[PDB]
Design a protein around this ligand. Structure first.
Ligand code: HEM
Ligand code: HEM
Ligand code: S7K
Ligand code: S7K
Ligand code: H4B
Ligand code: H4B
Ligand code: ZN
Lengths: 405, 405
């Protein structure tokens, strides 16, 4: 049947008909809803062939040349290549279309209003970890752009049956080290403890600060990873200050400008690209609320609350809430002052509402994961909290893959 | 591992498996193709008897007499009764057990650490609207208990073939009028425009303020609903003031102490109690964030922000967030001053985490609706944000039912 989708603030109804074009299973079945799960529950030629055709059809429809002779000849080439070789290759303009669609289709992304504006770097001619580094360095320079951040993706060579994958070991191109103490505690980012240790063990000389940038561990097929230190001028960073609380700068806090995810797999027409790092710009609550305030990250709420002189002995003073708001305010202010692109969670969710409306007219629906779209502070103050959403998997798609160690 | 849903906590790293979802004998809204967990509305003798047997088996396990001779005799008495009459009647202790189990089972309730402490008033002897009113007045006096609130449910007679239902038309026992204005705005609570107008059609003389307490519209089998005014000394209210912002008291805001939901159906062993009003106490975010700041409710955020002198022309000031926090704090402060029971969203969520642990040991799971359990401000600052949840329908249950008009 066809899901009814209601906005509770406005009373308006739509029906998602694009859901029918989904060829997958999500985590849920008749007897129990598993939507809150962060991981879905299980991480031949016919198969590949139908996924290939479907993707070729999406491409030629996108340029309004469906049924053309180009369309039919491309179907024939893909067929002939799969029948002899068990695999095929995309043309560059197909890869570009496919990367944009993968982003468009990502149900957890609030930034999708930007989906048509994505710079795609073809790095499928890469043959060594050394060459991976030069492409990664050029992507960072392009995407950073002295703070006028531009969305980008760099695509390395596809998985092939005979062989190991191209992989970037790091989860993002820029991450801070986390150093485990003999006494349990961590200095830096507890999220990166394991990658930190891998880096030491492949020969990195560690620092001892709270904000030490990690090197990259880059792996070409069936070779041990190699270590590459990013040149410090490539990594733009922003020191955090508050616009009225003078002591805030004293905390010595800072964050990197460029959020660039490097561990997800890109699937397009049945082909899998195991290294395809992509970047955009931050929404302030990622840094302000999750990276700095989560109890298992930098966990700085109590410090800020004491500096603000609040009553910490009791939850009903709403000390955590007042502190979180000021930290988010510091991130926005600080990024604005440094002229580095950032979006607050109100403007981001307003732009996502407009995206749902464009997609309803364009495609008859939009996949969206409510738990990840609604921000982690001030949920019900944003329009997306009051919006029902339907989550489903379309292809092309970004997916999780196993850590390569 | 096991064949049951894996449930992870991402803050602590801990994992459980829910085995309770096995006893869901009834499907939710989701299928393998699509997740519908943010949808708010979820659309025979042998049929009753399987539900009744199921519920009697639950009762007898709960008192540890399963397989007993008393258990077998009750099962037979229930079949005998259904057999001759089409229906059956619950013993007093079975109704008590059933009503607690329905609370315990409710996936959207964050207050369930309290489930075992529910005073059940048995009003199955009621024969008129006048008498429903007396029983509701007694329920309000008992639960309110001058500010020291006590959880309670009153159970009116069950649905019965042919004969009309008992129904309270109001959605809660205490509610504020909403009066549609000529220009098209609403004075009072816009949630309550329909019930307000029905009260007017049925002979109530309406006030014209922002916090006018509504009369109850109470319906006995096969009769026009009758109108009853609550004596105002029964309805405890709390005027709002802020602990440091002296002007906040001047806004003349207030809320009622008792949250008492009156339009849900209580289903136990296939029997349906169409009127069974229940009450607890407030979590502060319900008043402070949803009822006072939702755009479609009292919508007071801009007026507070203007009094705090905030920059309301730009989203990146975080003016919404800072005003919402102060409104929440005024709520907590004011309830505390007045000695009326209230819980903040940090205490509430921490207690719900404890409930989840208790239920893991008692029953091997707990059904929970993540989007409703995570509070509407400060989400990721509560431990429930980081906890995966499995949603499913167990019975006894509270269910929605269509409006009686
Ligand atoms: C341009 C600015 C962008 C913004 C502000 C943005 C915002 C976000 C946010 C806030 C999340 C939530 C992730 C988290 O909480 O961990 C996210 C998830 C995601 N975004 Fe974006 N996004 C942007 C660009 C991109 C780009 C360029 C791509 C790919 C081309 C992308 C693909 C995704 C994907 C795949 C996820 C899902 C991760 C998961 O499933 O775990 N987004 N986005
Ligand atoms: C003791 C204090 C209580 C607290 C703090 C509390 C808290 C809450 C809250 C915040 C919600 C979400 C409400 C909303 O967003 O509209 C809720 C839902 C609910 N609670 Fe409670 N609760 C309490 C007692 C009760 C009692 C006594 C019952 C029944 C005996 C009950 C049954 C429910 C049900 C059935 C729902 C779900 C409503 C739905 O599906 O729309 N709770 N609870
Ligand atoms: C559980 C798990 C396993 C594997 N990977 C992940 C997260 C992958 C991820 C993808 C997109 C964005 C983010 C965000 N955390 C980082 C980010 C990236 C971009 C491009 C923009 C932006 N504003 N923020 C993270 C989680
Ligand atoms: C769509 C629809 C149709 C019919 N009813 C509903 C909601 C019914 C409801 C149930 C429980 C709690 C609340 C809450 N809104 C009110 C409440 C009640 C209690 C007992 C405690 C507390 N802290 N807060 C509302 C929705
Ligand atoms: C259990 C829950 O699904 C998990 O904590 C999710 C909740 N929502 C999220 N939303 C975003 N954007 N990012 C996250 O990491 C999470 N974590
Ligand atoms: C669309 C979405 O399901 C809806 O707005 C929900 C979200 N979570 C909520 N959670 C609570 N506790 N109460 C609500 O009214 C809602 N509204
Ligand atoms: Zn689901």
């Amino acid at each position: 049947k066809f899901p009814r989708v209601k906005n509770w603030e406005l009373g308006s109804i739509t029906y998602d008909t694009l859901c029918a074009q989904s060829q997958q299973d999500g985590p849920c079945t008749p007897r129990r809803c598993l939507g809150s799960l962060v991981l879905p529950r299980k991480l031949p030629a016919e198969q590949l062939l139908s996924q290939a055709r479907d993707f070729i059809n999406q491409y030629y429809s996108s340029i309004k040349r469906s049924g053309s002779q180009a369309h039919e000849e491309r179907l024939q080439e893909v067929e002939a290549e799969v029948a002899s070789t068990g695999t095929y290759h995309l043309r560059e303009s197909e890869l570009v279309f496919g990367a944009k669609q993968a982003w468009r289709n990502a149900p957890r992304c609030v930034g999708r209003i930007q989906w048509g504006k994505l710079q795609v770097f073809d790095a499928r001619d890469c043959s060594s970890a050394q060459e991976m580094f030069t492409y990664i360095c050029n992507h960072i320079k392009y995407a950073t752009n002295r703070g006028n951040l531009r969305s980008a993706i760099t695509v390395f060579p596809q998985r092939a049956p005979g062989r190991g994958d191209f992989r970037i070991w790091n989860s993002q191109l820029v991450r801070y080290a986390g150093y485990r103490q003999q006494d349990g505690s961590v200095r830096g980012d507890p999220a990166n403890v394991e990658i930190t240790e891998l880096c030491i063990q492949h020969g990195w000389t560690p620092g001892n600060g709270r904000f030490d940038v990690l090197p990259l561990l880059l792996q070409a097929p069936d070779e041990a990873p190699e270590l590459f230190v990013l040149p410090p001028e490539l990594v733009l960073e922003v020191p955090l200050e508050h616009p009225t609380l003078e002591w805030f700068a004293a905390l010595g806090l800072r964050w990197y400008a460029l959020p660039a995810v490097s561990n997800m797999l890109l699937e397009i027409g049945g082909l899998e690209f195991s290294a395809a790092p992509f970047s955009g710009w931050y929404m302030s609550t990622e840094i302000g609320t999750r990276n700095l305030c989560d109890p298992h990250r930098y966990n700085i709420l109590e410090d800020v609350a004491v500096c603000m002189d609040l009553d910490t002995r009791t939850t009903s003073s709403l000390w955590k809430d007042k502190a979180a708001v000021e930290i988010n305010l510091a991130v926005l202010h600080s990024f604005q002052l440094a002229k580095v692109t950032i979006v607050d969670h109100h403007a981001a969710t307003v732009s996502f509402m407009k995206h749902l409306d464009n997609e309803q007219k364009a495609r008859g629906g939009c996949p969206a994961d409510w738990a990840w779209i609604v921000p982690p502070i001030s949920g019900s103050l944003t329009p997306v909290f009051h919006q029902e959403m339907v989550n489903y998997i379309l292809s092309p798609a970004f997916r999780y893959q196993p850590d390569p160690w």
